[PDB]
Design a protein around this nucleic acid. Structure first.
Ligand SMILES: [Mg+2]
Ligand SMILES: [Mg+2]
Length: 103
DNA sequence: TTTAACAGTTAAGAT
DNA sequence: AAACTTAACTGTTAA
């Protein structure tokens, strides 16, 4: 078990992958029902979970949109006009009108 | 500056 | 592991 760095267990059936919090740029809802996609530095992991629970895990995980939970540690910049959040790995996600200012 | 109506869309709670 | 339901979202628009 990785005890020295905060980690989240992402499950796939009886398989588990432990991912360090700051490996994660953001989570988004999957096109697949009841699944989410964790966007890591250079990998994506699809798993069963809910965005609400993830946002409750840690102050750094913020619900910036109904469909997205961002890791504040990995935000590089925000285009506030278009409400696009940019991450250190060059990915982006969207923030909602009601949540963008609270990031 | 603020809140929210509107109407379409979606996250998440039996088999 | 992977259909049906509806509260609560969404951006636009207005006040
Ligand atoms: Mg890292
Ligand atoms: Mg949080």
């Amino acid at each position: 078990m990785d005890n020295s760095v905060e980690t989240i267990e992402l499950k796939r059936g009886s398989n588990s992958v432990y991912v360090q919090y700051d490996d994660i740029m953001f989570f988004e809802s999957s096109t697949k029902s009841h699944r989410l996609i964790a966007h890591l530095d250079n990998r994506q992991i699809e798993f069963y979970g809910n965005l609400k629970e993830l946002s409750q895990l840690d102050d750094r995980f913020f619900r910036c949109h109904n469909s997205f939970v961002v890791n504040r540690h990995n935000i590089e910049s925000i285009d506030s006009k278009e409400r696009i959040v940019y991450f250190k790995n060059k990915e982006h996600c969207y923030a909602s009108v009601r949540n963008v200012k609270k990031i």
